[PDB]
Each structure stands twice: as C-alpha cells, then as structure tokens.
Amino acid sequence: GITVLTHSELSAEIGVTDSIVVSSELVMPYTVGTWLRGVAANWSKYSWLSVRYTYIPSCPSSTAGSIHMGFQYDMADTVPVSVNQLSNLRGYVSGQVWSGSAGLCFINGTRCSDTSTAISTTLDVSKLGKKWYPYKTSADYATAVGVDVNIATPLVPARLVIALLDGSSSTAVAAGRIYCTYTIQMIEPTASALNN
Amino acid sequence: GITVLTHSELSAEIGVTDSIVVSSELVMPYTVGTWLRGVAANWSKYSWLSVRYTYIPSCPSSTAGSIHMGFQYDMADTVPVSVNQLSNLRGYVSGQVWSGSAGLCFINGTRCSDTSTAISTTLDVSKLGKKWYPYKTSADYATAVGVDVNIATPLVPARLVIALLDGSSSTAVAAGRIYCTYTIQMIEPTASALNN
Amino acid sequence: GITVLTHSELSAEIGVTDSIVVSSELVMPYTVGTWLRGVAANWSKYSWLSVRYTYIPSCPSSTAGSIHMGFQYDMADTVPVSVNQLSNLRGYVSGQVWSGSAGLCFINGTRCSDTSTAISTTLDVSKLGKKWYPYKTSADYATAVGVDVNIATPLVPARLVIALLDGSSSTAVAAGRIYCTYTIQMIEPTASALNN
Amino acid sequence: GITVLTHSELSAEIGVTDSIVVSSELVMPYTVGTWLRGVAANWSKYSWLSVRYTYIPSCPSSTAGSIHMGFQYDMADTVPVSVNQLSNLRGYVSGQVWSGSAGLCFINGTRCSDTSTAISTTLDVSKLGKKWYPYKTSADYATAVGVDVNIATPLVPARLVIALLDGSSSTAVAAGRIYCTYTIQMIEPTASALNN
Amino acid sequence: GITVLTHSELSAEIGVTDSIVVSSELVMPYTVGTWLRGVAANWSKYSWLSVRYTYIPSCPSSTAGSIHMGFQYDMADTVPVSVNQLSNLRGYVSGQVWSGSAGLCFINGTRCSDTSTAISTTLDVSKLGKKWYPYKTSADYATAVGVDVNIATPLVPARLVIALLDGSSSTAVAAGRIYCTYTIQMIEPTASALNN
Amino acid sequence: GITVLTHSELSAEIGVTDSIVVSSELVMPYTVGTWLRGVAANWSKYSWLSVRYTYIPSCPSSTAGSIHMGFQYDMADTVPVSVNQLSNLRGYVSGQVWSGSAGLCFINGTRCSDTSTAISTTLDVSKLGKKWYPYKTSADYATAVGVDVNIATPLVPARLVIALLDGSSSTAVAAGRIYCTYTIQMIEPTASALNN
Ligand SMILES: [Ca+2]
Ligand SMILES: [Ca+2]
Ligand SMILES: [Ca+2]
Ligand SMILES: [Ca+2]
Ligand SMILES: [Ca+2]
Ligand SMILES: [Ca+2]
C-alpha cells in the first residue's frame, strides 16, 4: 500500500549579510515545501527514501558571502551558533554564495559527473530514529514541542541548519535558493482535512 | 525470549440507529479485549504479527443498517465524521449489519474460501511506527495524551474507527459484534502488578 | 516520473424508487471521489491502469429494487433511458438492491473467490481513446462541453451510467453505495492551484 | 514513410530585469523556430522523439539575474506566477543568468561529460497525450483556443514556461538565449501552402 | 471485447468532365458506405486495421479522363486544388479513367500478382492520431467542425481527396466507382439509437 | 558514518545492609559511566550492539548479603519492591555478595569458560523499542519525564534495577561494584557543547 514519489521543489530563498545568521528547518513533508505539503497530507504516515537539500545560486560571481548547511537529529540539542560548530555536523557542506550551479544535476534528476562543486547534502535516512513518521502540521508540532521538546523526536527525523555570512552588506542581498529533492513513500491514506 | 500467541476474542457489542455514530478503539493489548488484557500485562513489551477485527452478525436478514471500519495511525489526527471520510482510510470495509457471517472463518482459525462477504479487516503491522510497543493501561495512556496527544504515537500503533448508520430506529438495535483475532509476540516478562 | 497509486473510495450514495431513474458520472480523477480529486490535482496528467465501480448494499434483504451499471465512451452519445438499452453497454451489471456484498473483496484489496454475485464492473482501460488524460475540473470541463460535446472525448475516457428501479416507494429508499477502486498513474506534477 | 531529422536552432533571445517576468512558448514545430517552422510545414503530422530547450549565456560573470524553465501539458492550466510554483513543474531547471555554457554540448550534438551546470531541459515525449500531432500554425491554433482552450490538447503536446528575475535593472539586460535541439519524425507530406 | 470484421463495399460513383473537380470524403465508418454505417453504429468506438479505397472502371477504353486520389490528416488543412498539389499527398495514385481493373483483386479478397496497374490506395493506420476513434454521424460531426474545424482531429483519422479531369465533355461521363475494403475492429457495444 | 566502540568501565559502587534496598539506573550513554558519558556526547545518536552489567566482588568470603539485577523497559512501570517481583524480570541474576569473580572474563574482553558463577547480565538490544536513540543528559531527560514519564520511552531503551539485602549490618558494608561493558555505535557527530 505504498505510494512512492520522487520530486524536486523550492524550499527557501537565501540572502547574505556581513554578520552570521543561523536558521533551521524541520525535515518533514509539511515544511520542505508547499507542493509536498499539500500532497503528503492525504496520507497518514511517510518514510524518506531520499531527501537532499541543494543550494542553487542566482547572483554575480562578484557577490561576497558563503553558505553553510548541516543536520541535527535531537531537536532538544541547541542550534549551532558558529561556522566552527556547524562544521562538525553530519552532511556539512560549505561554499561561496555564487557557487553551486553543479547541484542542478540532482534537481533535474539527470545523471551528471562534475558534482564536486555542488553545495548539496543528503540525509542518513537509514540512521533516522525510525522509518515511518506521522504526517504533522506546524501548528500541531508547535504545540507538542511547547509542552516539551523531546516530544518531537518521534514526530520528526531531523532538522537542517543553515548559516550565512561573509556578505558585504548589513542588509540581506539575495544570493540564491535551496531546493529539496526527495523520494518519499506515503502510506495509509486519509481525508486531508483530518490530518493534523 | 519471545512468547508467541494466537487467539480470537470478543472486542465490542454493536448496535444500529438511524443516525450515524462514529467511535474508535485503540489497537493495543489492554483494549482489544479482557482476555488478552490480563495475559499481556505479564510482559513488558509486545509486537503485533497479525491483528484483525472482524464483524459477526446476530440479527435477522430484515435488519436495517450498515457497519463501517477503518484504521488511523496518528492519534492526533481528528476522527472521521462521515462514511465518505471513513472510506478513505486504510483497511476500510463496509457491509450490511446482517452480513459478515463468512468472517467466522478467520476467528475459528479454520481455512476457508468464501471470504468475499466477510466484514473483516487487518492491520499493516509492517508499516507501524515501530515493532515493539510497551504494554500500556488505559489510565496511564489517558494521562499521557492528556498532556499532549502526540505522546501517544510511541505508545500505540493505531486505532480502529467504526461507524454505524442506516438503521431503522433512533434507539440502538443489537446488530452483532466485533471480534479481534491476533498473533502477538510478548517479550520481557514482569510482575503484572507493576505494569502501567 | 510516474507516481502509481491504488486506492478505494466512496463514489456515490444510492436510493431506489418505483420508477426508473438514470444517471451518469464521468470517469476522471476529479469526479470519482473527494479524496482522489484533491490528490490528482497535484499532477498535470494521469492514466487509468484500473478503475472499477462496485456497489455495496446497506439495506434489508426485504428491500425492493434493482441496480444497473454500464459504460459509454462518446459523451456525445445520448444516455440510455431503459434497462434494455443499458444492458447493451460494455461492462453491464445488474442485481438486487440488497445483493452485492461479495464486491467488498475488490474494495478491501484482499483476494477472494466467491465473486459471482458482486455488482461490480471494470473499465476497458486498454481500449480508451488514449492513455494519458489531462486532469480536469468540473467547471472547466463543463464550459468545454458547453461549446460542443465532442470537445470532451480528448478530456475524459468514459462515463458510468447507472439506473435504479423496481423499488416499492415513489420516495427514494437508501439502498447502498457505489465505491470506486482504482490504480492510477499520475505524471508531470504542478502546483494544484494552477490545475484547471 | 517517416522522415527523421535532428537539428538545433535558435528559439528565443533572453533579457533580465529586477522584477519577475513569466512567459511560455508552445512546443510545436511552428513555434520552436523559424527553420523547423518552414521545414515541418511540408508534412501533415509529426512526432517528437526528443525536444530539449537549452539556455546559453552571452553576458559577463558579473551579470545579476537567474533563469527558470519548466513544462506544462494542459494549456487550460493557468501559467505559474512565481518561482515557487514554477519549481514544481516537470523538467524544472534554474541557474544564474551567466551560467549554462556546459549546455553547448547538447546543441553541438557532440558527446560530453561536464553537464551538471547546464541550464537545459528535455520533454517527456513518451508521456505526451499522443505520439502523432498535426502541424499547426499560430493563426489556426489561436482561433481554436479562442473558441475554447481545451481544443488545444489534441493540437499541441506541451508548453515551456520561462521566468526571469533577480536582475539589477528595471530595464531588460540581454543575458543570453534559448536554443531548441530536437529529433522530429515527420510524416504524410503535403504542399506547404495547404498546411494550416 | 473486440469484434473484427473484413468487408468490401461501394463508396462512390465516379464521373469525368473536361475541367478538374476536386472532392473529399471522411475516412470513418459512417461515411465509407451504407453497409458499414449501419453495422458500426452498434459499437461505441472502432479502429482501422486496414482501409483501402480502390477505383474500378466501367467505361470503354476510348473514354477520356484520369482519376487522382490521396490522403490528408488535418481537416483544418485546405483541400488541394490541382493535380500538382494532390500528387504530394500520402498514398497518391493516378490513372486513366478506364484503367484499374486489376484492383478487383483487393476487393474480392482473393490473392493476386498483377497489381501494378491498380488505382488503389491504403491508409497509414499506424500513423493516425490515435487507434480508437468514436463512431460519429455526419450531423454530429458537422456541428462540431461548425464550431471549429480542429475539433475534428480527435473525431476522424483522415480524409480521402479525389480529383477528376482530362475528360472530353463538360457534362460528367460515368467512368466507374470507388469501393472501400476494410478490416475494422469494433468495441464497446451500444444501442444504435443512442450513437451520435 | 558509524563509529563503533567496545569498552568496559565502572558503573556503580555497591554496599549491603540487612534490609532490602532497590535502585535503578538508566541504560543510556550519559548514565552508564563518566567515560562513555563524555565520549558519546560528541555524537547525536547511538545504538547498543551490546550492553552488559557485571558485578565484581571486593569483600571477604565471610561477608553476608546477596545482589540482584534485572531489566525493565517501560519507565512508566513501577519499580520492583521485592526479590520475588525482581526475579520475574528479563535478565534476572542473583548471587552472594562475595561471588561473581568469574565475571571478570567479560570485562577484560578475554575469552573464558567458567562463567556459570558470573553475576553478569546482558540487554536484549534486538528487542528494544528502536535501534537508534538520541544522546540525552540527565537534566534534559529529567525535565521530560517531569512532564510525563511516557515521554521517556523514545529517549531511553531500558533501566537496570538492582536490589541488595541479606546483609548482616543496618549500615551499608562495601561489597563490590558493577561494571558496564558495551559495544556502542555512535552516529551523526555534533559539537558536544550543543548536545542536550
Ligand atoms: Ca497526522
Ligand atoms: Ca508498561
Ligand atoms: Ca489540468
Ligand atoms: Ca496542418
Ligand atoms: Ca458515437
Ligand atoms: Ca542530544
């Protein structure tokens, strides 16, 4: 009763400043993107066969700045505050805010060789707490972690932390965007209106 | 250290009215029936190798009404309120309140062919959040979900929702009953008095 | 880039009167049911690997009436007005309004033998005009056929005509319902908001 | 009676501004380019064995801006209005307005490895409504969709939507151009003067 | 559920004048002949496994005139106005108004060798827009193309254009006739009275 | 990305009195010992390939007293209060407070035969709720179970309960100590300062 789906989609718009800015995003259907959010809601649970966040630039080669990404798995753990700490994470990747074009290969689904430069990273998937996670909505998840953060580990597999710095302006400069490419298995359908 | 057991037992008495009535039952040792409840309490955790709820009629062929069953896996999800929504669920089955005799085959354990008409449904089991669940008691479970519903996913694999309607009276008419047939693996024994 | 999905869902509620009543439903994602309607909208086109409408009773064995189903493929063709005409159609099935329980086998997905009595019918699929059809919405389709019915053949594969008669009352009596079981291939994803 | 032809040709000139600009082009012989337009007109119908739109830059590495491409198949569907929506489409590709040189490989017909960075995308072809489409002219097509958009699905296989933004000027800056590389099968010759 | 049928039948009476006269006939069950018209109406859709129009003479060897035939596939395309244009068409054949006797071989169904002289032509069949077409009636088809010609491509596979000239009189002289030999697959039966 | 490590370490000092004293310890990296606590903190999650608690004596053969050990898996379950209840647990072991020297074999890592007398016990490991658990700190864990005990099952695999009695004094007499020998798989590194 598995419905397998492979798709790429926009995940976040990216900008750079001269001071470091750290952020994180949950790695669950509801938050990766608007498309998958609407689709996955029609199923009770899901499993990540593959999830990869890849950064694609949209700025001039003269643009100052660098982007950093990595994964965390215990939402209770505190979020990195420096490139140093972030570099220790699983799947850590780093690159110039104007580099990463080679990552298109993964999004397009096409097969390619020159990937060395790609600012793209993939999830363990096989090392996650469990295989089948329940589809959650921000609101519901929010309330849960509101009671206690640990209530989250059985609700979400991991979070992607991002850091942007080395920019030339104190005012964000659009650098590019992060796309999410995934192969998800969705099971146990439900009327979407009932899925919290 | 596994103790495997296969047994059938009464789960619920069923009645029909002219207005739809939706209910749900947790799919855990403690709530499937009085027998298994007492037995499983002597073990710390368990796993469902097979769990099937099957409806058996006890009324005349002239009895008005229909029965509906399906599964949900995220206790946080809201319970169906209409046959339409319920029909989307995994393992959805529907039938006349006086049909379903063929389901006896499964309960009796005997091998049979003419199952088409059986108002019986089985759990994914292999698609549950995890394999080994802790034996819980209503009280303990109740308190947990009282704090937050999501605390439930790591405590119970699924819930069986039931709907009854199309009856001819506004006053429930005994139609039949739901029996649970299961093959459960029980592990890590404990003095029952300590199992919450 | 195919996303295959197999699912059963409620399609229509059925009632009987003493005078014949003929109706028809388009066999496209948008109209088979509310669930698939929402899901399929996220893809540009689709293909039916299998589509079957099966009637399940919910009334007493004493209920008067019979149900009739068949398929038509040229929306320009006029709809049958008598059981006689309807009996000529592809996939024609007929049965007592209280029979058809055996059809549950198909919905449940389970394997069964005693299907003889099932008031269920399946689509040619391999004999449809084409394989890949565009996802359409009632409104859009309506406007198209408003200009000319033939504009419909490249938009929808077929329609299911239904007839109900032999009832004992002039006022509809709830007899049962038609469920749709399908295996659909969905391709070329799109933001649902853009799908007309 | 098939006449197979493989050729690359200029499809569109591209410019960038600081505000998003979305456009689309039909994927049929008449509109891909002036060359194929004149050639294909000598045949009644055709089939796409392969069609790929690839973007080639002509600006400095310092040029601000990004280009976006994807496919739609139901001309009745509304055109994307944001990068987000566009990213959901089949064959979606994105890149800096000054990147994409690697795509030359495809145009030249030569065999190459370092394609990762290529801002190029190819059509399903095997998932199109049908295989053989009639050669149409803008005028004729225009009149048809004027009556009703759906009259288009049996006349054209798909449309390529394009989006340009992230530029530094409100006045378009020439960034590069889109070339179309195709392998088309042309059948049933006709005097070109008669082909509408 | 396919009903295959092979049959020959009269399609049109032919006459010649000293000025060219061009005409065309749709290649669909309803218009090839009175016999097939009545038969095919009992089925919803059909497919041409083989369709051949063959001219048989009935005049003296001294009769002046020549006959010309060819196929067109986009009803929107304008009809040829000269032998020159017509000669470009698929399946173009030409011959003296008193020649063509050898074509009898095809009609009779018998096997023959001396076919060189036969004024007979066959349809691509495998290169048609689609395989299964809906049975249409002149009236319905007429109304459709009345709205827009293109609505026709999904309703009919092709048209046979005919040209007659080189006659010795300005008043038509009976030369012979065109017979249609076909192998058609008919599917999805329907009461003929409902087939439009 | 797995870092496997096998090591033995001191877990607890043991003393005996004439009245029974029951205690328990969580079976997670942070609490087994000071060494592993510091090491494992550098990784996000871990898995127990093998965990064994073994008691080693340090008293005279004349020392009165006995030691008892067993495992529990649902932290919500109440802790045993008598040897009788404790004897029902998984991995229950019992022995004289001055026996158990043979257990050294396991700690030393060396291979040995005369293990009969060893007061040592090992964890199911394969029957735990899940395989990969998040590294937790006492404080964080404490707060979680403070909200609700059940929040613990997805944070810790099991607890080791210990009982000491049959001593000759009401004042604890140092009997020996419990060492923990484990083979742990650590994954997804993190800066230790961030691990809660
Ligand atoms: Ca949910
Ligand atoms: Ca318990
Ligand atoms: Ca659409
Ligand atoms: Ca044309
Ligand atoms: Ca028709
Ligand atoms: Ca942690």
UniProtKB/TrEMBL annotation, chains A, B, C, D, E, F:
A GO-annotated cellular component:
T=3 icosahedral viral capsid
Q: Which organism is it from?
A: Sesbania mosaic virus
Where is the protein situated, by its record's location annotation?
Virion
The lineage's top-level taxon is: Viruses
Family as reported in the entry's similarity comment: Belongs to the icosahedral plant coat protein family.
Domain Icosahedral viral capsid protein S, which positions?
Answer: 1-191
User: Listed disulfide bonds for this chain?
Assistant: C105-C112
According to UniProt, the name of this protein is Capsid protein
Q: Which residues of the full protein are shown?
A: 73 to 268 of 268
Q: Give residues annotated as binding Ca(2+).
A: D74, D77, Y135, N195, N196
Q: Which UniProt keywords apply?
A: Calcium, Capsid protein, Metal-binding, T=3 icosahedral capsid protein, Virion
Q: What is its main location?
A: virion
Which GO terms of the molecular function aspect are on file?
metal ion binding; structural molecule activity
